């Protein structure tokens, strides 16, 4: 069992006293529902199980799986939170939207062929950024795996021309990959002295059906901490809050303040919570205000974060010409990102906040997207812009927020 406490003044990222969430590691490869099996073989199958509900946003949300990589009755020093996202475009848009996201990219490549999925994964890893190549095609012939390793070495030579210098070609290979990740991936610098900002990615309800009147837990939200340290008992600050349009006009966003009653991770977490993992906070919020994936996209600040609820953001429209590494054998005008037309929906992924917005106006370098829900990240942060190509949200461009229409009710 752990031995953490509420006595801390200036913790570190590689602190062994917490042993819950030390660093985060992104995973984007050519898995096609094969990276979850690798995360279960590396960390555990039923290890990450805290609060389950109906899968609402499967392709839009990314799942974090903790792994306590120990060494030598073993001793644990640092833990790695593997971030698996359905579709590499969502993970690429989450990584290329600011700082402190996907610090250790894991390139789960296949030793079967050299198809375009690995090329798109390498393009997403180049657009995101320390890479970690790993072959998952186990149980093959000797000369066949040698030829596949030669083809992967040519692909890794092109990778090393861009950013490519990991080397790794069932449990023994997973243990060797975990030892190489513990020995190669350094500790990234995280700001712990700043205010705690918990961007919600998946909200849950801790109250069961037909519970007691006294034993009622409401508002067990879950997300990711950007920076700072969150302790139990601190009054959280929901930046989006309750958005109500009852005034027959512009919707008012009332910020709902709730004291953080507990910080419940996948394991028995302590009062202090650090960044780099799926942080679950059960506050003193109502069950109706925080339903199943209802309070998502809300910046749960701690000390009154400066980011106000913006309804219309005028950013710099900078779209790519073709898709990042996505080109089939036909390519009959498939990898061709069109211009920002009027009244077109786009998934702006500001950090972890993926909000849809319509293109109201566009003048040749400036697009004023009117978001459906209120977003509060920053005034000049790097905001992405995605577009559904064929039943899949793929990134189309990036930009910087030049202006915004803010609103703050009380």
């Amino acid at each position: 069992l752990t031995t953490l406490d509420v006595t801390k003044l200036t913790p570190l990222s590689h602190e062994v006293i917490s042993r819950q969430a030390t660093i985060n590691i992104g995973t984007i490869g050519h898995v096609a529902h094969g990276k979850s099996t690798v995360v279960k073989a590396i960390s555990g199958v039923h290890t990450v199980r805290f609060k389950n509900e109906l899968e609402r946003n499967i392709t839009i949300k990314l799942g974090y799986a903790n792994a306590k990589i120990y060494k030598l009755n073993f001793k644990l020093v640092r833990h790695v939170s593997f971030v698996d996202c359905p579709g590499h475009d969502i993970l690429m848009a989450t990584m290329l939207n600011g700082a402190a996201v996907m610090d250790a990219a894991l390139l789960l490549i296949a030793g079967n062929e050299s198809c375009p999925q690995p090329q798109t994964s390498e393009h997403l890893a180049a657009i995101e950024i320390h890479i970690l190549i790993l072959q998952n095609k186990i149980d093959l012939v000797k000369e066949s795996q040698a030829k596949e390793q030669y083809e992967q070495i040519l692909a890794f030579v092109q990778g090393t021309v861009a950013e490519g210098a990991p080397i790794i070609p069932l449990k023994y290979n997973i243990e060797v990959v975990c030892e190489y990740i513990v020995k190669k991936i350094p500790v990234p610098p995280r700001d712990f002295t700043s205010e705690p900002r918990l961007i919600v990615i998946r909200s849950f309800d801790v109250n069961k059906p037909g519970c007691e009147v006294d034993d009622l837990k409401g508002g067990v939200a879950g997300g990711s901490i950007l920076k700072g340290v969150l302790k139990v008992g601190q009054e959280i600050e929901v930046r989006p809050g309750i958005v109500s349009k009852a005034s027959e006009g512009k919707l008012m966003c009332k910020p709902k303040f709730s004291k953080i009653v507990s910080l419940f991770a996948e394991h028995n977490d302590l009062q202090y919570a650090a960044p780099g993992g799926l942080i679950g906070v059960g506050t003193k919020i109502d069950p109706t205000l925080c339903r199943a994936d209802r309070m998502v996209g809300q910046v749960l600040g701690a000390v009154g974060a400066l980011p106000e609820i913006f309804t219309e953001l005028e950013i710099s429209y900078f779209l790519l010409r073709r898709l990042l590494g996505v080109r089939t054998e036909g390519d009959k005008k498939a990898a061709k990102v069109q211009k920002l037309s009027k009244n077109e929906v786009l998934m702006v992924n500001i950090g972890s906040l993926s909000t849809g917005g319509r293109v109201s106006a566009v003048k040749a370098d400036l697009g004023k997207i009117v978001l459906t829900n209120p977003v509060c990240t920053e005034v000049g942060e790097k905001i992405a812009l995605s577009r559904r190509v064929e039943k899949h949200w793929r990134l189309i461009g990036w930009g910087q927020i030049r202006r915004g229409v803010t609103i703050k009710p009380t």
Binding site: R56, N57, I58, T59, V243, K245, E248, L251, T372, K391
Partner: protein, 426 residues
């Protein structure tokens, strides 16, 4: 459990131009009764307990129209909830505001504000409820269709719908329209996913009364790109590996259900309401409580209001409705047409499949065929009209000036073909 319903009283397609530029398309009279009253009477004949009317464009006019109706009275069994906001401009925006407000509870109805129907869907509601109870909330939407013929004048080529469904459990597998398509292509995975039965249906008129779970509002909050109903169904049917959510279907063969989308659907639904195809919703039945719409029904579907003062030699042979206070001269010949209340008709006039609203004034010797005359209109003498001629909001047509076939006149220059005056030449 109660039965909730949402009513999109603002059709977001730019089709009724420039008719919807003065009063919206849900306030136009079919036979002296707006389509809002028809849809609300269909909802109370269904058995709903509370509705949610959503209107964006000219919403104050819709509000002042329906507050003086029968459904806003405290003795009404079906209450209404008027929700007014100029922010939304799509049905998906309406459903995501429903999800943000959390109005509905379970198995709520979805209807447009211009749907004419008399179907009791308690059987389809119980079928949807049992399909949700056995398969544990797998069935999400129950679309409703009417058995019709593809050559019928109700369904036009712009709104023809071809589906491919199952035969024994009637779940929808494919759904598309025929908007400029001589050859139709259906996917191959529908046979591999269901090896028990599959049937392609073209005999299905869409009535847009697709009852549904509250999970469609959740799916509209997830997918912001889904603008309306049909692209939502077309995206849900192709995204079956994740968030399956099979859509089921109900067919009606003994009851009527349709909507309007242009002048063709308006003419066909008006000719069906006059020919009593949407019984019990009948003009002489007076389903809304108003003294200015009380009528009597003679032979050959002749509908006569109070104080008409019919003249000598006037011939009403088939499918004629006369409003209260409509003045009709001598030697007229009216057939297959509806006349509003308080009109003035001249002498030696013919009316062939026309749609005359309130306050019009037709002089003597006018020949009007298959036209649409809106409120407070004026028509001079010695004029011959052609089919599909629209004049909106007091357009005066000068003497000795015939109109072509495709001719729409209004007070707005760039929306209509031209603007008229006391003289028709400019």
């Amino acid at each position: 459990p109660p039965l909730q319903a949402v009513l999109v009283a603002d059709s977001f397609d730019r089709r009724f131009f420039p008719i919807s530029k003065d009063q919206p398309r849900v306030l136009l009279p079919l036979a002296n009764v707006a389509l809002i009253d028809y849809t609300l009477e269909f909802l109370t004949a269904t058995g709903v307990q509370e509705t949610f009317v959503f209107c964006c464009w000219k919403a104050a006019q819709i509000k002042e129209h329906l507050l003086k109706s029968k459904w806003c009275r405290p003795t009404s069994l079906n209450v209404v909830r008027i929700i007014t906001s100029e922010l939304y401009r799509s049905l998906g925006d309406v459903l995501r505001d429903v999800d943000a407000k959390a109005l509905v509870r379970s198995d709520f109805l979805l209807v447009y504000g211009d749907v004419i129907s008399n179907i009791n869907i308690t059987r389809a509601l119980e079928e949807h409820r049992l399909r949700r109870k056995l398969e544990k909330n797998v069935s999400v939407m129950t679309m409703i269709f009417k058995e019709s013929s593809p050559s019928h004048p109700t369904r036009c080529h712009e709104d023809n719908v071809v589906v491919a469904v199952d035969s024994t459990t009637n779940r929808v597998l494919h759904f598309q329209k025929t908007q400029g398509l001589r050859r139709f292509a259906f996917p191959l995975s529908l046979f591999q996913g269901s090896s028990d039965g599959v049937e392609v249906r073209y005999d299905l008129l869409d009535c847009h009364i697709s009852i549904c779970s509250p999970q469609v509002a959740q799916l509209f909050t997830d997918n912001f790109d889904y603008q309306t109903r049909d692209d939502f169904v077309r995206g849900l049917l192709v995204n079956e590996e994740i968030l399956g959510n099979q859509i089921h279907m109900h067919v009606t063969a003994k009851e009527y259900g349709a909507r309007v989308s242009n002048l063709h659907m308006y003419s066909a639904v008006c000719a069906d309401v006059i020919r009593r195809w949407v019984y019990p919703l009948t003009p002489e039945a007076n389903f809304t409580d108003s003294t200015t719409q009380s009528c009597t029904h003679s032979r050959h579907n002749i509908y006569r209001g109070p104080e008409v003062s019919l003249g000598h030699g006037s011939i009403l042979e088939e499918n004629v409705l006369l409003g209260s206070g409509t003045v009709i001269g001598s030697n007229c010949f009216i057939t297959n047409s509806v006349i509003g209340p308080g009109c003035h008709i001249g002498d030696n006039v013919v009316l062939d499949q026309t749609y005359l609203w309130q306050g019009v004034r037709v002089a003597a010797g006018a020949q009007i065929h298959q036209s649409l005359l809106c409120d407070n209109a004026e028509v001079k003498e010695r004029v011959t009209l052609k089919p599909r001629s629209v004049l909106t909001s007091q357009v005066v047509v000068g003497p000795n000036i015939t109109l072509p076939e495709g001719s729409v006149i209004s007070l707005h220059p760039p929306d209509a073909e031209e603007d008229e005056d006391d003289g028709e030449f400019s």
